[PDB]
Amino acid sequence: STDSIVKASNWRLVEVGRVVLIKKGQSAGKLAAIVEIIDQKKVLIDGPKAGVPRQAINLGQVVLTPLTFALPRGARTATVSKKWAAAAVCEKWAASSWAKKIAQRERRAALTDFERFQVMVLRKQKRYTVKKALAKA
Amino acid sequence: AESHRLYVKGKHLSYQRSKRVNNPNVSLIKIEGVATPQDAQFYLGKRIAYVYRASKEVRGSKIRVMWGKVTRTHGNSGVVRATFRNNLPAKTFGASVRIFLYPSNI
Amino acid sequence: MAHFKEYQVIGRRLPTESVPEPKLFRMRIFASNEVIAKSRYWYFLQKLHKVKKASGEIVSINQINEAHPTKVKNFGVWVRYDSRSGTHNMYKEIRDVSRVAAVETLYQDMAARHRARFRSIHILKVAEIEKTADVKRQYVKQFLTKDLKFPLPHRVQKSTKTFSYKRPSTFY
Amino acid sequence: NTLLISGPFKVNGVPLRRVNARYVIATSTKVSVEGVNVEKFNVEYFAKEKEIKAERVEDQKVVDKALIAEIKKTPLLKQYLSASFSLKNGDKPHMLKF
Amino acid sequence: VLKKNPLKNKQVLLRLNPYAKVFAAEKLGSKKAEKTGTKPAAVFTETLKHD
Amino acid sequence: VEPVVVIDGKGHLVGRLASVVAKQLLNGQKIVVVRAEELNISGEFFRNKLKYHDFLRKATAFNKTRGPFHFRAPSRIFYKALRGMVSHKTARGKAALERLKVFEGIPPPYDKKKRVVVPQALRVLRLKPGRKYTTLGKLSTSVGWKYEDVVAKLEAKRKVSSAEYYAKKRAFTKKVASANATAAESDVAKQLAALGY
RNA sequence: UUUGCUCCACACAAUAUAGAUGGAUACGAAUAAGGCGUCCUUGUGGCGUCGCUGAACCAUAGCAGGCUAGCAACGGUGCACUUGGCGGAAAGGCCUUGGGUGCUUGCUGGCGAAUUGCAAUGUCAUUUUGCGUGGGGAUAAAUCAUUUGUAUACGACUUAGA
RNA sequence: AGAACUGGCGAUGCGGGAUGAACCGAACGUAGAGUUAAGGUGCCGGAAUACACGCUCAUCAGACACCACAAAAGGUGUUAG
RNA sequence: CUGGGCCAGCAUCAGUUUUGGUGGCAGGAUAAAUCCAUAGGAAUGUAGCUUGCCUCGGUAAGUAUUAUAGCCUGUG
Ligand SMILES: [Mg+2]
Ligand SMILES: [Mg+2]
Ligand SMILES: [Mg+2]
Ligand SMILES: [Mg+2]
Ligand SMILES: [Mg+2]
Ligand SMILES: [Mg+2]
Ligand SMILES: [Mg+2]
Ligand SMILES: [Mg+2]
Ligand SMILES: [Mg+2]
Ligand SMILES: [Mg+2]
Ligand SMILES: [Mg+2]
Ligand SMILES: [Mg+2]
Ligand SMILES: [Mg+2]
Ligand SMILES: [Mg+2]
Ligand SMILES: [Mg+2]
Ligand SMILES: [Mg+2]
Ligand SMILES: [Mg+2]
Ligand SMILES: [Mg+2]
Ligand SMILES: [Mg+2]
Ligand SMILES: [Mg+2]
Ligand SMILES: [Mg+2]
Ligand SMILES: [Mg+2]
Ligand SMILES: [Mg+2]
Ligand SMILES: [Mg+2]
C-alpha cells in the first residue's frame, strides 16, 4: 500500500438517541431510547411506543443496538414518541438479523408437540432433496 | 425412535447436610436443564428412580430400582430435594438418576 | 439507612401552661423508614435546641417525593463527617435524577473513599446546582459538554451455562 | 376417576382402555368426538368377571372408524398418533408446550 | 382433640362469629370509601416543599 | 450432558477453571483438560515465580523424599490447584479425580475432538484490562519443566494439520450451502419458516 | 509332571461395574477486536454480512419398532468387502476408489397390536474368568542345587556347566 | 497477683468461631414436617462465580469480633477533601 | 382359586406447612410524575438574519430566545 491504514474499532456509542435493548426486568426484551446521560454507568431512557417508562437505568442491564435517531438531549416522553415514530425505529429494528432471531427463538418455543412432529417431517422432506443436489456437482 | 426416554436426566449430588453432619434421609438431586428454583417447581412431587445392576436375579431380573419423589426445591440454582423409600447408598453421589413426568398436571 | 426516602419531620416542645403553643421545628431527613426518620429528628434537635423527646413531641412526618424525578440534575452536597482522627466538613457534587438517588451514592461514596459509615456522617445541605458552570467538581463538569458521547469498550456478556462451544468476543 | 382411551387401535395398536389422569400429558391438539357413541362404556364394562370378548373387538371397530374418519381430515395427525413420544437431548419438559 | 383454625375451614370460622356470613356477603372486606374534595392549605405545601 | 468434556485450557485462569472442574467431577462428569501450558495466572510473572519458590522451599526435613512433591509441569501445576479443591483422601475423592485428565499440548485422541471453553474462568473475560498476568508453561520451565519446546514443536505440527483439516471442511460447508441454495428458497422451506425452522 | 498352549468366530455358567439410555459436533488467533462470504496487488488490502450465546447444528415417525404391495429418486445409511492415501505426542485412527447387500419416514396402499387389564416390574450396555466346539497357528524357559569371586552378614549380585 | 456487680466454666452436651473449658447462638425425653439463630453460600462444603457504587496492584498485597500483635516516622503511588 | 396380612397408586378430605396465579378495597401533595392549558425564562442557543471561509454544497464566529428542534421554572 501507500496509504496510511488505521482500522478503528467502531463501537456502539452511548449518545442521546442511541436506542437500546433492555436486558433485565419488567421491561425486559423491550426497546427504549437513550434520552440523557447521567454518568459513566447510568443513563436516562424512555420507551414510549413499547411501553417502557422513562427512567434512570443502569447501563449494565441494557444492550446498545446499532440504531440511532435524532433527538434533542433530555426530551420529555412525548417528543420522544414523536421523534421515534418519525424515524421509523421499530421498522428498522424488525429488519435486523438480531430482531429476527429473537422472533424465531420465540416461535420455536411456541410449537405444539404436533408442530414439532411436523417440522421433523418436512425437514426430512427437504433433506432428501438436498443430499441429491449435494451429489450432482 | 433412537430415543425411548420418557424422563429427565438427573445426578445424585449429596445427602442434605451442614458442614459436618449429613441427613441420609434427604437426597439432593440436580435435574438436568433446570437452572432456577422457579423451574424446579415443575418437577416437585414427580417420581425419581435410581436404577442399578446386581448379580442375584429376582423378578427374573438383574436390574433393580430404588423409587422416590422430588419433594422441595433447594437453594438458588435448580437443585431439588428428594426422599426415597429406602435412602440412596452414598456410593451413588455423582451417579445418574431418573425423573419422570408423572404425577402430571399438564 | 439503605434504600432512601426523604422526610419532612415537624416537631415541637411539649406545651406548658406558661407556653401554650411552642414554636414548631422542621428538618428534611433521609432515612429508609419513618422510625429511623423520627429518631434522627431528635438526634439533631437535641444538638441544636435544648430538648429531648421525653420533653417534646413529633407533630408531622411526611415524605418529600422528588418534584421532577426524571430530570437529570447536578447536585451540590455539603457534608460533615468523622474520620478516625478528626472531624471535617466536605463539599462534593453528584449527578443523578433525584435527591433520594443522590444521597445514596453520597452515602456509599463516603464509605468507599473515606471509610465513613452512615453513623459518622451529617448531611449539611443538598442542592440542585442551577446554572451549569456553577458546577466546580470536574468529575461532573466532564459530563456537561455538548453532544457528549462515549463507547463502552470490552463488553463482557455474562454466561448462562458453564461450557461454551465458542471463544467469546468482547466487541460492543 | 379414570379416562376412556381408544388409540385408535388401527392407528397405533392401543385398545379402548382405562388410564389414570395422573400419568398422562394432555396435549393441545384435539379431535372432534361428536360422531362417537361412547355412552355404553363404563366401569362395569371393564369389570373383571386370556380370550377377548367379541364385544370388545367389535366395539373397537365402531368407535375407531369414526375417530379415524375425523383424524384424516387433518394432515399428519394420523402419523403423529402412530409415532411414540420420547424426550430428546435438549428437551426441557418445564418449557415445552405440547 | 384436634385444633381447627377458623382462618381456614369455614365451618369453625362460622362456629365462632356468625357475622362472617354477612361480612362476606356485603363484601366490605373491600368497600369503597366516600369522597371529599378538601384540599390542603397553602402553608402546608409551602413548608413541605421548603428547603 | 456429554460423556466427556474436553477443555482447551488456553487463556483460562488457573484456580477458577480448577474450581469449576473440581465440581464437574464430584458430580460425575468426565473431564479432560488440554493445552494446560497456555493456562493463565493473575499477577505478573515474577510474583508467581516467587510464589512457586515458596512452594519449593517446603520439604520434610528428615527425608525430603516424603516431603511435599513439587511437580513442575503445567498439567501438574494445574492438577495441584484442582486436588486442593477435592477431598482426595476419600474414596469419593479418588473416584472424582479418576474422572480427570490434564495434558500439555493436545495429544492424539483429543486432537481431533471438539474442545470447549469455560467463560467464568476465561482470563480475557474475568481479568480487568491492563492487569498483569502469568503464563503457566513459561512459569514451568522457569521452575524446571523440561518439555516447553517439545510441546510447542508438536503443537505447531498439529496446527498445520488441523488447519488444512479446517480449510477442507470450510470448503465443504461452502458446497452444502451452494447445494442448499436450490432448496433454501423452496416451498418446504417456506413451510418450515412458518415454524421457526 | 499326564493335563497342553496361542490367535479369530459364535455358544453356555458364573463374575464384576463411581453409574450408556438420540450424537464428545476437531482451525488457529485477537478480545482497545474478530468470524464467515467474495474480489484482489494474496496484503496490517477492497466490498458485503454476522454476533447481542449451544433457546445452535445434526439426527429423530414404524411389534424396544412387525408382515405385506408399489411410485418417484440414483439419493441417504448400516453392514461385510475392496482401490488409493495420510496419521508416531499416547499415531491403533482418519480421509479416499469400486461394486455387493439389508434398511430407507421422499411418496401411495393392504394387514398387525387388545387381556401385560389404571403406575410398580422395563432396551440390554461391558468387564473379567472358567469351561464347549472348527479352523488357523507356534513347539520355550526360570528357579532349586552344583560352580566363579569383578559380589557378598543372610538374601541378593556376577560367572560357568549337555 | 488481688477486690467490686453480674453473667458464665466448673457440673453442659447441641449449632457457629478450622482447632479450642470460658466468645457468639442456644441449653438437651424418643421422633416426623416446617422455620430460624449465631455463622455462612468460588471449590474442598449444604447454600447467588448474586445484584450495586467506589477503593486497592504489593519483586513482603489483603482477606472479619474474643484472636493468635505491631509503633514513632516517611512516600511526586493513587483516591477524595 | 377367594378371604386375610402387608404394601402401593389415584380420588375426595382433616391437620401442619411450603410455593405460584388472580380479584376487590384503603391511604399519601386524596402519591410524586407523564399528559394537558397557560405565564414566564434560559443555554451545552433550534430556525432565521449578519460577516469573513468555501468545493457556492456547506462552515465559523456573532446575532437571535421558538421560528424550519426542543428544554427549564411557576400556577392551573
Ligand atoms: Mg468493535
Ligand atoms: Mg442441605
Ligand atoms: Mg402403527
Ligand atoms: Mg488466576
Ligand atoms: Mg474431611
Ligand atoms: Mg469485517
Ligand atoms: Mg470469535
Ligand atoms: Mg480485509
Ligand atoms: Mg452450530
Ligand atoms: Mg417385543
Ligand atoms: Mg490418552
Ligand atoms: Mg411408578
Ligand atoms: Mg573378591
Ligand atoms: Mg455457657
Ligand atoms: Mg471439682
Ligand atoms: Mg455450653
Ligand atoms: Mg479463628
Ligand atoms: Mg480442602
Ligand atoms: Mg455447593
Ligand atoms: Mg468467577
Ligand atoms: Mg475491634
Ligand atoms: Mg497519600
Ligand atoms: Mg390440603
Ligand atoms: Mg407542552
From Swiss-Prot, chain A:
Keywords: Acetylation, Cytoplasm, Ribonucleoprotein, Ribosomal protein
Miscellaneous comment text of the record: Present with 45300 molecules/cell in log phase SD medium. There are 2 genes for eL14 in yeast.
Family to which the UniProt record says this protein belongs: Belongs to the eukaryotic ribosomal protein eL14 family.
Organism listed in the record: Saccharomyces cerevisiae (strain ATCC 204508 / S288c) (Baker's yeast)
Family annotation (InterPro entries): KOW (IPR005824), Rib_uL2_dom2 (IPR014722), Ribosomal_eL14 (IPR039660), Ribosomal_eL14_dom (IPR002784), Translation_prot_SH3-like_sf (IPR008991)
Stretch forming the signal peptide: none
Function: Component of the ribosome, a large ribonucleoprotein complex responsible for the synthesis of proteins in the cell. The small ribosomal subunit (SSU) binds messenger RNAs (mRNAs) and translates the encoded message by selecting cognate aminoacyl-transfer RNA (tRNA) molecules. The large subunit (LSU) contains the ribosomal catalytic site termed the peptidyl transferase center (PTC), which catalyzes the formation of peptide bonds, thereby polymerizing the amino acids delivered by tRNAs into a polypeptide chain.
Protein name: Large ribosomal subunit protein eL14A
Cellular compartment(s): Cytoplasm
GO terms under biological process: cytoplasmic translation; macroautophagy; maturation of LSU-rRNA; ribosomal large subunit assembly; ribosomal large subunit biogenesis
Record PTM N-acetylserine, positions in chain: S1
Superkingdom field: Eukaryota
Primary residence: cytoplasm
GO MF annotation list: RNA binding; structural constituent of ribosome
One GO term describing the cellular component: nucleolus
Residue ranges of the TM segments: none
Post-translational modification: N-terminally acetylated by acetyltransferase NatA.
UniProtKB/Swiss-Prot annotation, chain B:
PTM remark: N-terminally acetylated by acetyltransferase NatA.
Protein name per the record: Large ribosomal subunit protein eL33A
MF terms (GO), sorted A to Z: structural constituent of ribosome
Domain of life: Eukaryota
Organism for this UniProt entry: Saccharomyces cerevisiae (strain ATCC 204508 / S288c)
InterPro entries xref list: Ribosomal_eL33 (IPR001780), Ribosomal_eL33_CS (IPR018266), Ribosomal_eL33_sf (IPR038661), Transl_B-barrel_sf (IPR009000)
UniProt subcellular location: Cytoplasm
GO BP annotation list: cytoplasmic translation; ribosomal large subunit assembly; ribosomal large subunit biogenesis; rRNA processing
Residues modified as N-acetylalanine: A1
Family: Belongs to the eukaryotic ribosomal protein eL33 family.
Additional information: There are 2 genes for eL33 in yeast.
UniProt crosslink position (Glycyl lysine isopeptide (Lys-Gly) (interchain with G-Cter in ubiquitin)): K46
Swiss-Prot record, chain C:
InterPro entries: Ribosomal_eL20 (IPR028877), Ribosomal_eL20_dom (IPR023573), Ribosomal_eL20_eukaryotes (IPR021138)
Sites bearing Phosphoserine, chain numbering: S32
An example Gene Ontology biological process: cytoplasmic translation
GO cellular component: cytosol; cytosolic large ribosomal subunit
Summary of subunit composition and partner proteins: Component of the large ribosomal subunit (LSU). Mature yeast ribosomes consist of a small (40S) and a large (60S) subunit. The 40S small subunit contains 1 molecule of ribosomal RNA (18S rRNA) and 33 different proteins (encoded by 57 genes). The large 60S subunit contains 3 rRNA molecules (25S, 5.8S and 5S rRNA) and 46 different proteins (encoded by 81 genes). eL20 forms multiple interactions with RNA and proteins in the central protuberance, connecting components of core functional centers that are located far apart.
Family affiliation: Belongs to the eukaryotic ribosomal protein eL20 family.
Protein name: Large ribosomal subunit protein eL20A
Organism encoding this protein: Saccharomyces cerevisiae (strain ATCC 204508 / S288c)
Gene responsible for this protein: RPL20A
UniProtKB/Swiss-Prot annotation, chain D:
Alphabetical GO biological process terms: cytoplasmic translation; ribosomal large subunit assembly
Recorded GO CC terms: cytosol; cytosolic large ribosomal subunit
Cross-link (Glycyl lysine isopeptide (Lys-Gly) (interchain with G-Cter in ubiquitin)): K50
GO molecular function, one term: structural constituent of ribosome
Posttranslational mods: N-terminally acetylated by acetyltransferase NatA.
Nuclease listed as a keyword: no
Main location per the UniProt record: cytoplasm
Keyword terms of this UniProt record: Acetylation, Cytoplasm, Isopeptide bond, Phosphoprotein, Ribonucleoprotein, Ribosomal protein, Ubl conjugation
Subcellular location per the Swiss-Prot or TrEMBL entry: Cytoplasm
Subunit structure: Component of the large ribosomal subunit (LSU). Mature yeast ribosomes consist of a small (40S) and a large (60S) subunit. The 40S small subunit contains 1 molecule of ribosomal RNA (18S rRNA) and 33 different proteins (encoded by 57 genes). The large 60S subunit contains 3 rRNA molecules (25S, 5.8S and 5S rRNA) and 46 different proteins (encoded by 81 genes).
Additional note from the record: Present with 37100 molecules/cell in log phase SD medium. There are 2 genes for eL6 in yeast.
Annotated family: Belongs to the eukaryotic ribosomal protein eL6 family.
Protein name: Large ribosomal subunit protein eL6A
Parent sequence residues shown: 61 to 176 of 176
